[PDB]
Design a protein around this nucleic acid. Structure first.
Ligand code: SF4
Ligand SMILES: [Mg+2]
Ligand SMILES: [Mg+2]
Ligand SMILES: [Mg+2]
Ligand SMILES: [Mg+2]
Ligand SMILES: [Mg+2]
Ligand SMILES: [Mg+2]
Ligand SMILES: [Mg+2]
Ligand SMILES: [Mg+2]
Ligand SMILES: [Mg+2]
Ligand SMILES: [Mg+2]
Ligand SMILES: [Mg+2]
Ligand SMILES: [Mg+2]
Ligand SMILES: [Mg+2]
Ligand SMILES: [Mg+2]
Ligand SMILES: [Mg+2]
Ligand SMILES: [Mg+2]
Ligand SMILES: [Mg+2]
Ligand SMILES: [Mg+2]
Ligand SMILES: [Mg+2]
Ligand SMILES: [Mg+2]
Ligand SMILES: [Mg+2]
Ligand SMILES: [Mg+2]
Ligand SMILES: [Mg+2]
Ligand SMILES: [Mg+2]
Ligand SMILES: [Mg+2]
Ligand SMILES: [Mg+2]
Ligand SMILES: [Mg+2]
Ligand SMILES: [Mg+2]
Ligand SMILES: [Mg+2]
Ligand SMILES: [Mg+2]
Ligand SMILES: [Mg+2]
Ligand SMILES: [Mg+2]
Ligand SMILES: [Mg+2]
Ligand SMILES: [Mg+2]
Ligand SMILES: [Mg+2]
Ligand SMILES: [Mg+2]
Ligand SMILES: [Mg+2]
Ligand SMILES: [Mg+2]
Ligand SMILES: [Mg+2]
Ligand SMILES: [Mg+2]
Ligand SMILES: [Mg+2]
Ligand SMILES: [Mg+2]
Ligand SMILES: [Mg+2]
Ligand SMILES: [Mg+2]
Ligand SMILES: [Mg+2]
Ligand SMILES: [Mg+2]
Ligand SMILES: [Mg+2]
Ligand SMILES: [Mg+2]
Ligand SMILES: [Mg+2]
Ligand SMILES: [Mg+2]
Ligand SMILES: [Mg+2]
Ligand SMILES: [Mg+2]
Ligand SMILES: [Mg+2]
Ligand SMILES: [Mg+2]
Ligand SMILES: [Mg+2]
Ligand SMILES: [Mg+2]
Ligand SMILES: [Mg+2]
Ligand SMILES: [Mg+2]
Ligand SMILES: [Mg+2]
Ligand SMILES: [Mg+2]
Ligand SMILES: [Mg+2]
Ligand SMILES: [Mg+2]
Ligand SMILES: [Mg+2]
Ligand SMILES: [Mg+2]
Ligand SMILES: [Mg+2]
Ligand SMILES: [Mg+2]
Ligand SMILES: [Mg+2]
Ligand SMILES: [Mg+2]
Ligand SMILES: [Mg+2]
Ligand SMILES: [Mg+2]
Ligand SMILES: [Mg+2]
Ligand SMILES: [Mg+2]
Ligand SMILES: [Mg+2]
Lengths: 231, 148, 208, 137
RNA sequence: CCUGGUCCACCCGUGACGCUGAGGCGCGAAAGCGUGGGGAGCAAACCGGAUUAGAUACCCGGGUAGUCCACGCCCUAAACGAUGCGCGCUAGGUCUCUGGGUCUCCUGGGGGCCGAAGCUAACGCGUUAAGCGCGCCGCCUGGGGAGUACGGCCGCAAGG
RNA sequence: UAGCGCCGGCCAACUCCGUGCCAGCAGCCGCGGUAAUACGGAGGGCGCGAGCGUUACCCGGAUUCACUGGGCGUAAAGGGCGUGUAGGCGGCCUGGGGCGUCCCAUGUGAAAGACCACGGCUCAACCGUGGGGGAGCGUGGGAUACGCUCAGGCUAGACG
């Protein structure tokens, strides 16, 4: 499952826009660029996946965090493939720390599902349709992956702990383990299970996500061959 | 469940056109008198809700005090901004010698025997915070040998 | 001197029955049993929560008004136990107990401590022989406290020993009824005596 | 520089507050005696005489606790506290009888005595006093 | 022309010769003073015109000390970074000035900004600490009375 | 024989009338301008008790002179800046001494008082008997890590 042709996909980026805590996972600066010791990536995959694999067979949910436009679509395929929740658009404040309240806003979604599946009155004003439809069209935009989540995840898995510091912040306050693919602009000490790698190139996001999705499905009852990606 | 005590209840005001409009706050400790306390601070439009709101936080932030025959294991001095609290271990028949603030905090924590002293700003809310963070920094011989 | 006044107003304030008479304390003509609320114009109003200081004074007068004791003697007896070795609380109770005027009453020589005083002050009591008319004597282990022979034929002490025929008396005391003599075995552990009082709080009253 | 010991204790205290693996102090037979106790009593892993750019130093291997769950992952310290007592400004000595008990036993006090560098315990066993160098917990 | 501090590179010389600093001594913006010059512009005082209830001001026209030079006094300040000096330790990004290199950049020394840890009552400080430490000095102890009075020393006086 | 202080918050104890910024209360914040638990009386209540209150003074609360145990950017607080006298303070290695420092043995540290036990006055106050010490200084012996001194080296501080 592990693989070594990762250097055929990322080895890292971003110059002196670095975070000094990450130096322990950096090989050298060549291309005017911080370069990640890929060896140092394997070590942490071994330990991180052990967590994920051990987390797999226990039948426990995982929240998928990626919202930079470089990792936007690629998380949506993969979280569904493993049948687990994600956030694609905005990470709402209090998704975790205020779950019962945020998820009180999925009950409005599930309730819209039914109402627009006929009939429960269509003699409701034309303009109210206009209003309700768009609201469904609005709600749908954000919550499509969060709706699966019906309880606090036993872990969360992140693309950018720097870009999604808020997510990381809530998880911490809820003692939830934090997992993340994360490059040198990020804060290492902040993540429990670290995948020290490029977090912007779609290449790198595909390799590390999918193979982690596969490790999840492998120990969660079955296996399957390849998954969708743009070249 | 725990034994619960309201230590502080205050009214504060804010200003806008037409005059002042108030808001209330309650410092509340809660504990089992057997090694577990928690301090919560609740603010609300009316006294009762604030007292209840407070209680929920009190349970939301707790701490485990290593009682040894009803006294704390070692000296602790702790500062919280300009507030300082001294907690000093005390022998059996001593009693709990503290101001009504750290008194109720330590009391609900099962502390039966202790010498204490408040130094610096004795502001009720801050002396509270300093008493807690003192407990949260209490250690025992076990805890020490395990670290080192 | 001592308190020497209306005594039911005392229990009514304390919220608890203190056994300050004897006979009437048990009948339903007892004041607490008719009115369990503080004496005077404002007793039936709904109370307001007492402050820490309010609470402690009240626990103190409780233990104190039991004994019919002056604050000075109380304070000094207390400030003894504060100095002397061990746990303060027990020793204070202990030294409180070793009072003759108390000892006489715990034995059932008298129906009240107030009567146990008039028994002591009128010489009707004796300690290991010698006449003693001092309510304040600190009775020590091994002491035998008895009635004077020259008064032993008195209605009150005979009638009051009548109840005592097989009556229980605390573990540290023995009693030869008819013979009119009792014995002090030792000063109490807090267990032996169940005064309706949280004794730690009295220390804290004085820590102020 | 006016105080080697105070510099030494301090070089550490800064290093432990941001969890460095080690840090180096300029070498002295007296610092070796203090690090020795600091080694044995287990506030540090241990130390070794290295050399920096031609100059003698002591490299001291720091020791900490475990990662913590929560908003602040930063592991507990092993040296919570370290500070000079006796200083060049105000020399501090204690007779045997007034030797202090640091933190109700859970800590130590290092000494300079005519029998060598000893702890509060040791000094009381050997029966000697000395200049109270510092305190640690 | 005469002269001071200061950085850099070489790692050549001395071998703890160091740090601080009560008194002392010197330096010390402006205004001010003494004797003598100088005086274009500017301008306290002062005159006049406006404004105004008034206008001993703000605005306009004039104008003397002074502002400049030499020598000698005065020694004060929001004399400020409202931050005594020295040393060691504790992430980094960036802009700039100035040496040196193996001239991407590396290394020293100064000048700014943002920020790690930490500090802070907060504001903010943060390798130019207001952080963690040592040494020595100066200073604070409720507002006013009062930087006044008295004494004392200094000054031509102002006054310090 | 039972008296005296208090009942707005601190701080334990509340009602009616009388007064109307008057009369008066007051340790501090504050009370009194027609529904005053704050003034005067009464009832009731709280606290002590042959006592209770008041004035004055001493320590405490005051880590508010800070040795324990504080501070100086904006709260009170860095000297306007240098230079330097006394003084305080000082790097790495080795030896002599043993001044500071630590230990041991001894002398002194009177009696009363303090404390612990016991005992005598019916208890207690009071008093008796015994017990346990300490610093600090004199003397003898010992210790040598740190600070001291003397001596001999070093080059990381400092100067050239
Ligand atoms: S009767 Fe009830 S109230 Fe009156 S004294 Fe006896 S016990 Fe106390
Ligand atoms: Mg990135
Ligand atoms: Mg614990
Ligand atoms: Mg502070
Ligand atoms: Mg405070
Ligand atoms: Mg103990
Ligand atoms: Mg204060
Ligand atoms: Mg206060
Ligand atoms: Mg009873
Ligand atoms: Mg209580
Ligand atoms: Mg005791
Ligand atoms: Mg009883
Ligand atoms: Mg007291
Ligand atoms: Mg000290
Ligand atoms: Mg050389
Ligand atoms: Mg000078
Ligand atoms: Mg001048
Ligand atoms: Mg001039
Ligand atoms: Mg003039
Ligand atoms: Mg002139
Ligand atoms: Mg002229
Ligand atoms: Mg004019
Ligand atoms: Mg005019
Ligand atoms: Mg004019
Ligand atoms: Mg003009
Ligand atoms: Mg002139
Ligand atoms: Mg002039
Ligand atoms: Mg300036
Ligand atoms: Mg400057
Ligand atoms: Mg100034
Ligand atoms: Mg100022
Ligand atoms: Mg200075
Ligand atoms: Mg300073
Ligand atoms: Mg350059
Ligand atoms: Mg160049
Ligand atoms: Mg620079
Ligand atoms: Mg400039
Ligand atoms: Mg800044
Ligand atoms: Mg921070
Ligand atoms: Mg910088
Ligand atoms: Mg400050
Ligand atoms: Mg005054
Ligand atoms: Mg004044
Ligand atoms: Mg003057
Ligand atoms: Mg002046
Ligand atoms: Mg004068
Ligand atoms: Mg009184
Ligand atoms: Mg009182
Ligand atoms: Mg009250
Ligand atoms: Mg009148
Ligand atoms: Mg009225
Ligand atoms: Mg009053
Ligand atoms: Mg009244
Ligand atoms: Mg009397
Ligand atoms: Mg008197
Ligand atoms: Mg005083
Ligand atoms: Mg004091
Ligand atoms: Mg001090
Ligand atoms: Mg202060
Ligand atoms: Mg200055
Ligand atoms: Mg000057
Ligand atoms: Mg100087
Ligand atoms: Mg000198
Ligand atoms: Mg010297
Ligand atoms: Mg030295
Ligand atoms: Mg020597
Ligand atoms: Mg010597
Ligand atoms: Mg002696
Ligand atoms: Mg004596
Ligand atoms: Mg006797
Ligand atoms: Mg003593
Ligand atoms: Mg030697
Ligand atoms: Mg030499
Ligand atoms: Mg050099």
């Amino acid at each position: 499952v592990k693989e070594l042709l990762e250097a055929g996909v990322h080895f890292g980026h971003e110059r002196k826009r670095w975070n000094p805590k990450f130096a322990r996972y950096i090989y050298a600066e060549r291309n005017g660029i911080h370069i990640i010791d890929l060896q140092k990536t394997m070590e942490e995959l071994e330990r991180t996946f052990r967590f994920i694999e051990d987390l797999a067979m226990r039948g426990g949910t995982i929240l998928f965090v990626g919202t930079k436009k470089q990792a936007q679509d690629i998380v949506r395929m993969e979280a569904e493939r493993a049948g687990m929740p994600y956030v694609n658009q905005r990470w709402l404040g209090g998704m975790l720390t205020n779950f019962k309240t945020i998820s009180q806003r999925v009950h409005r979604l599930e309730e819209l599902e039914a109402l627009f599946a006929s009939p429960e009155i269509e003699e409701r004003p034309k303009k109210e349709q206009v209003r309700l439809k768009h609201e469904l069209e609005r709600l749908q935009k954000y919550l499509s992956g969060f709706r699966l989540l019906k309880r606090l995840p036993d872990a969360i898995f992140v693309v950018d702990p720097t870009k999604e510091a808020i997510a990381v912040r809530e998880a911490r306050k809820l003692f939830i383990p934090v997992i993340a693919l994360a490059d040198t602009d990020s804060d290492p000490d902040l993540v429990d299970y670290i995948i020290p790698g490029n977090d912007d190139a779609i290449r790198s996001i595909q390799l590390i996500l999918s193979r982690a999705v596969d490790l999840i499905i492998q120990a969660r009852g079955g296996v399957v061959e390849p998954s969708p990606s743009y070249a | 469940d725990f034994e619960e005590k309201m230590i502080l209840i205050r009214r504060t005001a804010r200003m806008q056109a037409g005059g002042r409009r108030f808001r209330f706050g309650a410092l509340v400790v809660v504990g089992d008198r057997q090694g577990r306390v928690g301090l919560g601070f609740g603010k609300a439009p009316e006294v009762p809700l604030a007292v209840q709101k407070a209680g929920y936080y009190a349970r939301r932030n707790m701490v485990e005090v290593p009682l040894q025959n009803g006294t704390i294991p070692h000296e602790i001095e702790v500062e919280f901004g300009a507030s300082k609290i001294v907690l000093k271990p005390a022998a059996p028949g001593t009693g709990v010698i503290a101001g009504a603030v750290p008194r109720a905090i330590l009391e609900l924590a099962g502390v039966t025997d202790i010498l204490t002293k408040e130094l610096g700003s004795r502001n009720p809310i801050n002396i509270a915070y300093a008493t807690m963070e003192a407990l949260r920094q209490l250690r025992t011989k076990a805890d020490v040998e395990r670290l080192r | 001197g001592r308190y020497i006044g209306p005594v039911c107003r005392l229990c009514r304030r304390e919220g608890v029955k203190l056994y300050l008479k004897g006979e009437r304390c048990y009948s339903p003509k007892c004041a607490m049993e008719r009115r369990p609320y503080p004496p005077g114009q404002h007793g039936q109003k709904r109370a307001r929560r007492p402050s820490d200081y309010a609470v402690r004074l009240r626990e103190k007068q409780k233990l104190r008004r039991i004994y019919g004791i002056s604050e000075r003697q109380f304070r000094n007896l207390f400030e003894e136990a504060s100095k002397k070795k061990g746990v303060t609380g027990s020793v204070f109770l202990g030294l409180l107990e070793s009072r003759l005027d108390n000892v006489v009453y715990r034995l059932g020589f008298a129906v009240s401590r107030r009567q146990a005083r008039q028994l002591v002050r009128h010489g009707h009591i004796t300690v290991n022989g010698r006449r003693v008319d001092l309510p304040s004597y600190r009775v020590r282990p091994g002491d035998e406290i008895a009635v004077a022979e020259k008064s032993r034929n008195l209605e009150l002490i005979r009638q009051n020993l009548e109840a005592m025929k097989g009556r229980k008396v605390g573990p540290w005391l023995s009693l030869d009824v008819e013979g009119m003599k009792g014995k002090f075995l030792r000063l109490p552990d807090r267990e032996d005596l169940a005064l309706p009082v949280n004794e730690q709080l009295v220390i804290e009253f004085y820590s102020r | 520089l006016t105080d080697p010991i105070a510099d030494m204790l301090t070089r550490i205290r800064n290093a432990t507050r941001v969890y460095k693996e080690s840090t180096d102090v300029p070498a002295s037979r007296f610092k070796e005696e203090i690090l020795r106790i600091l080694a044995r009593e287990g506030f540090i892993k241990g130390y070794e005489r290295v050399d920096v750019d031609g100059k003698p130093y002591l490299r001291v291997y720091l020791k900490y606790g475990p990662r913590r769950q929560g908003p602040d992952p930063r592991p507990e310290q092993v040296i919570h506290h370290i500070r000079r007592i006796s200083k060049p400004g105000r020399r501090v000595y204690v007779g045997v009888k007034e030797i202090p008990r640091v933190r109700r036993g859970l800590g130590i006090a290092i000494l300079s005595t005519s029998k060598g560098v000893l702890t509060d315990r040791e000094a009381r066993k050997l029966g000697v006093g000395g200049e109270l160098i510092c305190e640690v917990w």
